[PDB]
Symmetry: C11
Subunit: 69 residues, 11 copies
Amino acid sequence: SDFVVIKALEDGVNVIGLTRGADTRFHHSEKLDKGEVLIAQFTEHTSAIKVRGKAYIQTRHGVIESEGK
Amino acid sequence: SDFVVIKALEDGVNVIGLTRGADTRFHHSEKLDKGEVLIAQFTEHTSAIKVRGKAYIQTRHGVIESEGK
Amino acid sequence: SDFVVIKALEDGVNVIGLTRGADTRFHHSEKLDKGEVLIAQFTEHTSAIKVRGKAYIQTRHGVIESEGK
Amino acid sequence: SDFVVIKALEDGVNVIGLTRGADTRFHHSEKLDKGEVLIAQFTEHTSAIKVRGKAYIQTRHGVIESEG
Amino acid sequence: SDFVVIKALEDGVNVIGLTRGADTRFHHSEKLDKGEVLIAQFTEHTSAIKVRGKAYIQTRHGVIESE
Amino acid sequence: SDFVVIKALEDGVNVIGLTRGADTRFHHSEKLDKGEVLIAQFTEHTSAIKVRGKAYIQTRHGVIESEG
Amino acid sequence: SDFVVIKALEDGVNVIGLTRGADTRFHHSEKLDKGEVLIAQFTEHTSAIKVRGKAYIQTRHGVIESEGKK
Amino acid sequence: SDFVVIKALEDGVNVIGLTRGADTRFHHSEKLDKGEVLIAQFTEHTSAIKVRGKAYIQTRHGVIESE
Amino acid sequence: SDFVVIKALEDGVNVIGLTRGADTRFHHSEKLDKGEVLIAQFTEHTSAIKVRGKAYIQTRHGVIESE
Amino acid sequence: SDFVVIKALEDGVNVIGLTRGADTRFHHSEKLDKGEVLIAQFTEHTSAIKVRGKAYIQTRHGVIESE
Amino acid sequence: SDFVVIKALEDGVNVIGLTRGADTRFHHSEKLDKGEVLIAQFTEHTSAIKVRGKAYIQTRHGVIESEG
Ligand SMILES: N[C@@H](Cc1c[nH]c2ccccc12)C(=O)O
Ligand SMILES: N[C@@H](Cc1c[nH]c2ccccc12)C(=O)O
Ligand SMILES: N[C@@H](Cc1c[nH]c2ccccc12)C(=O)O
Ligand SMILES: N[C@@H](Cc1c[nH]c2ccccc12)C(=O)O
Ligand SMILES: N[C@@H](Cc1c[nH]c2ccccc12)C(=O)O
Ligand SMILES: N[C@@H](Cc1c[nH]c2ccccc12)C(=O)O
Ligand SMILES: N[C@@H](Cc1c[nH]c2ccccc12)C(=O)O
Ligand SMILES: N[C@@H](Cc1c[nH]c2ccccc12)C(=O)O
Ligand SMILES: N[C@@H](Cc1c[nH]c2ccccc12)C(=O)O
Ligand SMILES: N[C@@H](Cc1c[nH]c2ccccc12)C(=O)O
Ligand SMILES: N[C@@H](Cc1c[nH]c2ccccc12)C(=O)O
């Protein structure tokens, strides 16, 4: 099942999982401080992932950076 | 199942899911602000995705820029 | 299952779904304003999709523009 | 399941599907005007597709233009 | 399931389907006029396809012209 | 299933299908005339194909000419 | 089923497993010391992996170095 | 399921099929004359194939000549 | 299923398999002497591999040296 | 299911099959003479293959010569 | 499953199979003499293979050499 790579470039980065199914909501928010990496998969409970803050992200489609503020 | 990456290039971008099945309507609209990144899958509930607002998008098939009015 | 990417290159583009089965009719028409992106899959209800209006399109087989007059 | 992309290079192109099974006949004819794009799959009901008129076509095996 | 692309480069091309199973015969023949394209699959009823006439042919294995 | 492209570069080319199973015998022989193309599969009834005559052949593994 | 390659570049790196399911919490931390390599999969119990401290990571998507503190 | 392409470089080439299962023994030998091509598959009955004669062979793994 | 290649560069390398399940603990420790190669898979019992000592490692994502 | 290509490079080359299962023993040894090709699969009966003699070998992992 | 390719580069090369299961023990040791090639699979009974001796190894992930 796919996964995404997130590296925080700053303190307080947020990787939020949104619930799978009929409803759409935040079920979990993982805080990442500067330099930490989170490797997260799409699962039965998570069908969309939002990154808040400055981070460096890798997926099967390539590299992208979110930006804070 | 496949997924799309959307980076908001401006405030208030909308990432909108359209219902799977015989009936077709928007079931959810995730608002993104400038620099935030949304990674979203095609699921049991979502069979088409619409982006409104200025964003940068990556999919299996290439990259695309959406633009606001 | 596969999807197509459509960017409207003018207001009023139409993205139309053709019914899966022994009959073929339009069951849905999604309207796109200039700059808006629709990412759409081939589903249990849709086995053919028709684009009307000027649009930039990307599929698994490459890019193509649609032109209407 | 595979699909074909068809862009009408003139008014009145026809995208015709042929019925899957022991019988072969046309079951449907989608007409395209100039510039319009049809993206169509192979289905439980369609196992062959015929395009008539001038069109620009894309498949897994490459590009091809039809001429009426 | 695999398919073939056939463009007729003259009138009267004929794309013939041969039956699947223990017996082998033509079960259909689709004529093509100059410039017409047929995109056809291998199916529960068709395990072999024969092209007669002048045609520009595309498959998984490459391009081929029939003469 | 996989298939084989066979174009005849002379008259009388023969595409022979051999039986799948514990016994091995030809069960069908499709005759090709110069220029014709035959696109056939491996199937429940055919597990080896033999080509007699001069032909241009394409498979998953590449081109190859037969001489007969 | 996918896996991640982790090499500690300093002592006291932790590779943390996040539980699969409606709840999300750390169920395990593997300590790595400088030069040690952990090769770990996504599983029935782990659906997200967090690396603390300096490490050199290889996944299907390429290379990345963690630099988190402590 | 896979196959091998075998072209006879001389008369009398022989493509032999060895049985699948606990016993190994040849169950067929298709003779090929100079120029003839045999396209054959690994099947329920064949788990190994021996070529005797001068043949040009094509597999998933590349080309090889038998001598 | 996936595997890793481990070449010991020094006597005493220790290849540790960690338990698949809710609990994580080493279930086996395989020691290698300098120059030996262990080729190991992920399996129903092993979901994580830990490598102590100086070794040369090959996986699907590339090469890496434990130190 | 995968296979390997074995070309004998001298008379008396030997292709040995090892049993699948808890026990491991040879259950068949197919002798090849100079220039002959054997194309063999991993099967329900064979989980490992040993080559004895001077042989040219192609697998999915590349070419190798036995000595 | 996948397989490894092992060629003995000296006499007495030992290819050891480790048991699949909750327990991990050697269940077999194939002895290889210089020049002999053993091509082995991961199986129902083998989940990990050890090579002792100077041997030339090919896997999906490339070549590697064990040294005696
Ligand atoms: N609950 C939605 C979450 C989602 C995934 N992809 C989306 C795209 C747009 C909007 C919402 C979504 C779903 O499972 O379908
Ligand atoms: N509910 C529709 C939505 C849809 C998906 N792809 C489309 C393409 C065109 C029009 C509508 C759609 C469906 O499941 O089919
Ligand atoms: N109802 C048709 C619609 C269709 C799909 N592909 C086509 C190609 C040509 C004509 C019609 C179609 C079907 O499901 O088969
Ligand atoms: N009824 C046919 C239509 C067809 C598909 N591919 C063909 C090739 C040649 C002739 C006819 C066909 C089928 O299902 O088999
Ligand atoms: N009836 C044959 C038709 C066929 C397929 N491939 C062939 C190759 C050679 C000769 C005939 C065939 C089949 O289904 O098996
Ligand atoms: N009846 C044999 C035909 C065959 C296929 N591949 C072969 C290779 C060699 C000899 C015979 C064959 C089979 O189905 O098994
Ligand atoms: N408990 C969560 C963990 C998770 C995986 N990927 C995530 C992305 C964001 C937030 C949480 C997660 C799950 O199994 O879905
Ligand atoms: N009867 C054997 C034949 C065989 C296949 N591959 C082999 C390799 C070596 C020796 C014999 C064989 C089997 O099915 O396994
Ligand atoms: N009994 C173990 C053998 C094993 C395979 N890979 C390993 C990696 C590390 C330690 C032991 C192993 C297993 O099947 O689970
Ligand atoms: N008990 C764990 C072992 C594990 C695999 N991957 C991990 C990543 C981090 C922490 C522990 C692990 C599991 O199977 O889930
Ligand atoms: N009976 C053993 C044969 C074998 C295959 N691969 C091996 C690797 C090493 C030792 C023995 C083997 C098995 O099927 O597992």
